[PDB]
């Protein structure tokens, strides 16, 4: 059985998130909450609420054990942006692109 | 009345993208570039199937001035010999015989060598 | 003659010559007006005589 969970319009770029996930994939589950809260970044406290929703639905909806339960698919994909403007020296102006992401985790047994 | 262009555009544009397949990078996603290499691919191919006929007529002679050298014979004095006997066998045949046997190639040569 | 079998005579009708609609037609970019002068201008030419 393969549970999942998705977080939607989360307000961080994808290129900044994808550095943490490569440290999380193809691993155990309780070998991931640890490595997450020992990584000083701002992505880490939102990939930590998103395992624990895929682990709390393999217990009440689908009835698996948390003892051996690993991570099989985690990925981030782009989203909608938010266009803004910064003024400059002369009367000119310049673009700003505040970006978003969607996050997706999959926990499986064997 | 009015005519707004529809699907004729993006049809014509992907009968080409589907021919540019195996090409590096943006030469299999972009129409303005793909179209330029599908074109040269037609003028190269046109040029190659008039040159293929010039490659393989080198191997056949490459491989006869080896076999004749074994038995004290150049290429020229071989192909001059049969000019008197009259053997009108092409190359592409002398390649595949003398690669296989020697005994026919024993008779074959000795008449070219006879008539000189 | 039954409104779905209609065929006018031979030599009567023809199709137009449309211009600047490609290479293979024989009248493409320049469209007759060969290269740059006064006769190759929008509202060119000269009053006759």
């Amino acid at each position: 059985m393969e549970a999942k969970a998705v977080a939607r319009t989360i307000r961080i770029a994808p290129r900044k998130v994808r550095l943490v996930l490569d440290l999380i994939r193809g691993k155990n589950a309780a070998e991931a909450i640890a490595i997450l809260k020992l990584t000083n970044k701002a992505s880490s406290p939102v990939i930590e609420k998103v395992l624990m929703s895929a682990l709390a639905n393999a217990e009440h909806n689908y009835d698996m054990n948390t003892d051996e339960l690993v991570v099989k698919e985690a990925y981030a994909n782009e989203g909608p942006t938010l266009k803004r403007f910064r003024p400059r020296a002369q009367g000119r102006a310049s673009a700003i692109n505040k970006r978003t992401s969607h996050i997706t985790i999959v926990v499986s047994d064997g | 009345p009015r005519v707004k262009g529809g699907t004729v555009t993006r049809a014509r544009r992907k009968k080409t993208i589907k021919l540019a397949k195996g090409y590096f990078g943006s030469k299999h996603t972009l129409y303005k570039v793909a179209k330029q290499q599908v074109m040269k691919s037609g003028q190269y191919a046109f040029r190659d199937r008039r040159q293929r006929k010039r490659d393989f007529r080198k191997l056949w002679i490459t491989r006869i001035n080896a076999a004749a050298r074994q038995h004290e014979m150049s290429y020229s004095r071989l192909m001059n010999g049969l000019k008197k006997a009259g053997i009108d066998i092409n190359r592409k045949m002398l390649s595949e015989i003398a690669i296989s046997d020697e005994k026919a190639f024993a008779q074959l040569v000795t008449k070219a060598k006879d008539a000189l | 003659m039954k409104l779905h079998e209609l065929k006018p005579a031979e030599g009567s009708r023809k199709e137009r010559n449309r211009v600047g609609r490609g290479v293979a037609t024989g009248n493409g970019k320049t469209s007759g007006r060969g290269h740059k002068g006064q006769k190759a201008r929008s509202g060119g030419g000269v009053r006759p005589g």
Partner: protein, 145 residues
């Protein structure tokens, strides 16, 4: 397509020969050596694989130069540095390191491909008269007139 048989890796048997460099002109020899490495003189020659044979050369030092060109057959060289044209030798090399002078005349008669370097790494050249390659039963090879 049709009947023009190709050689591949399996249909090849490569051999080991010996040649003597006593009383011979330099390039007149190496014109005849770079073809044995290259796959001519077989009847399975194909131009996209290595069908040629192994060649051993002995007693390089007894190699002769006609006219007078042990003094004005300079071998220039450069080092990608300013003022680095090194005319390090004229014809001393016959005396010092003769085992190279025979090894550059042959590698120029061959091409400059990803392959025509490889079929020059099957050359072995000695100024002595004894070779350590006796495990391989290398035959002799007398030459063409």
């Amino acid at each position: 397509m049709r009947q023009t048989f190709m050689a591949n890796e399996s249909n090849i048997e490569r051999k080991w020969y010996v040649i003597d460099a006593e009383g011979q002109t330099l390039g007149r020899l190496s014109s005849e050596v770079a073809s044995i490495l290259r796959g001519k003189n077989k009847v399975t020659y194909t131009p996209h694989v290595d069908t040629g044979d192994y060649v051993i050369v002995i007693n390089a030092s007894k190699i002769e130069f006609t006219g007078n060109k042990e003094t004005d057959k300079v071998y220039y060289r450069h080092s990608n540095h300013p003022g680095g044209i090194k005319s390090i030798t004229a014809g001393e090399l016959r005396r010092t390191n003769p085992e190279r002078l025979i090894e550059n005349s042959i590698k120029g008669m061959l091409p400059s491909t990803r392959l025509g370097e490889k079929q020059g790494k099957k050359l072995f050249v000695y100024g002595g008269a004894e070779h350590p390659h006796a495990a391989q039963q290398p035959e002799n090879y007398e030459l063409r007139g």
